[PDB]
Amino acid sequence: SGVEGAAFQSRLPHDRMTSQEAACFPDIISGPQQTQKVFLFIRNRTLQLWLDNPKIQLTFEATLQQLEAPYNSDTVLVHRVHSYLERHGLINFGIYKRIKPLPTKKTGKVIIIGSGVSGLAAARQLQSFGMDVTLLEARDRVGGRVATFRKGNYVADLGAMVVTGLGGNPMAVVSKQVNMELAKIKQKCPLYEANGQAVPKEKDEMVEQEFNRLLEATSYLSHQLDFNVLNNKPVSLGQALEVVIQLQEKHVKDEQIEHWKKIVKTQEELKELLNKMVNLKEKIKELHQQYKEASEVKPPRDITAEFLVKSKHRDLTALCKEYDELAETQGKLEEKLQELEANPPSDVYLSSRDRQILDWHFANLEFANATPLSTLSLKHWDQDDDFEFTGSHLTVRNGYSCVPVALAEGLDIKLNTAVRQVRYTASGCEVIAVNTRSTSQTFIYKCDAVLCTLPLGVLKQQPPAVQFVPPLPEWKTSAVQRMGFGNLNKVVLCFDRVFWDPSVNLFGHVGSTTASRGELFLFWNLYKAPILLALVAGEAAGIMENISDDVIVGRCLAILKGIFGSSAVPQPKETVVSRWRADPWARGSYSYVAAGSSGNDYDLMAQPITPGPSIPGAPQPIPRLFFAGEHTIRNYPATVHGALLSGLREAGRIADQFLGAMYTL
């Protein structure tokens, strides 16, 4: 690591200029190789400096201070580099001590819809760049899809929960800036069938291995066999898995068929030999009689009578020779049949008990993608894989909300303000919002640009919950309908005493049917207090929303009783149940690559909108409407860090637009 490790931590190749860098420094990247390596060093070093101390602002001066020759010889290059990094939120982002107090007077006015992480992140950035920033939040709280339940000492995240490894995670920086209590998750997850009996390590390891092998198989189907369109429709992951399983059941049968068919060839070969043997014993029976009769003719006898005895003696031993060579053959074939019938091929591909545990592994995947596997795009469901972080996944032990709240400090946030209409024209924007409490109480907001961090579920609403004037262009609205917005729910169970294995972080429950594989399939022990957290995933998630809390808490205890003892499970003091699809400010949990979509749609979502000219024949206008949010970041969708980065991204773009890019020259 060191200089090179900082580039990795900032999600950048240490020894190559990015496309964004090619854009801002076209003089360098087109120029000689020597210059490029100097550029790259300056970049990497500046990042290192910022990362090593992320709680204070890193100024141009401080950066130049700690450089060597010939890296500090060119001060305009260093300044361009520093400014580029600062603009695009690679350095001086989040919550840090400011050296030069905020600029005396502001430039430009920006309305940000929603104070989710993406919103807040961008807000802080723009305010850092000296812009007038006001966020409009429909909820009575910040954070949005980052929600944390708090009551007494009970702390449990109903929204975002896991930091998916620190290796290249911008949340690594944030966690140093905010008092986040990050605790690692222990991999092991013991399973328990419907009865309450633990799945033995025999089955457990077998099914899981088969699960992973089934996934690889679908990948093979997609890329190598190009099985992606079936009857004009795009093939889902669900379809692909069924197809693979069926082909694996087909093989199990094919094996048996040509094994028994192998027996009948040997069995029928024996049939033919036994016939030859019986027909020979018939001739031997008759020949012995003839020889006997010939020997009863007592001597002296003429030569023909002597010859008869000898002839029949020769003819018999010759036929007795054959029969013994056939009893030889019989012996070999007889045990060759005991060979084949001793070791048959697999009876079944998977039993009912097996297929149920496999459904749990599917449910786990349905949780991860927050959607039934029949909706995920086979080809693209995992497109964001290459950009996955290193390090073990962690949980915010003191509640994730600590992060949005900390980001929200020093920002103009209008809570309980539901945006109803967004108006954007060549000369500017007006945002029409109402008070959520008295919905007849109206607000108008005027701004140079609108940053829209509305969830994809919201953008999907029909009839629309937010109106765009003029209407969003066809290419944008298509991208909204194509993309998948999933669902995933959490059940918070607060007890007074820990009745589970304290060294076990998570344990599964296997449902009875495929239909209900997602229903309460997983439990979390993560926090200080005795809190267990139950997940509702897949198809089950959407249906469980129409069921009342008591019943859900019922099924929860029922299951927990089955695993720990019908008496060892007390009544829960506090219970909370999420309903994200029902939540009007979410309309679901987070995005997924739906069948018929791709990673490209995420880029489309990020592309800003530019209004038509006021006066016809007037010049091409500035872009006015911008989009950030978890569903706009192709390489980090459906996460916090994704949102966080999408925020930083738009901020940089908006600041470039309205304050001007001073660093490109």
Binding site: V162, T164, C189, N364, L365, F367, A368, N369, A370, W381, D382, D384, D385, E388, F389, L506, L522, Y592, P637, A638, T639
Partner: peptide, 6 residues
């Protein structure tokens, strides 16, 4: 996405 897998 993929990364949420247990």
């Amino acid at each position: 996405p993929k990364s949420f897998l247990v």
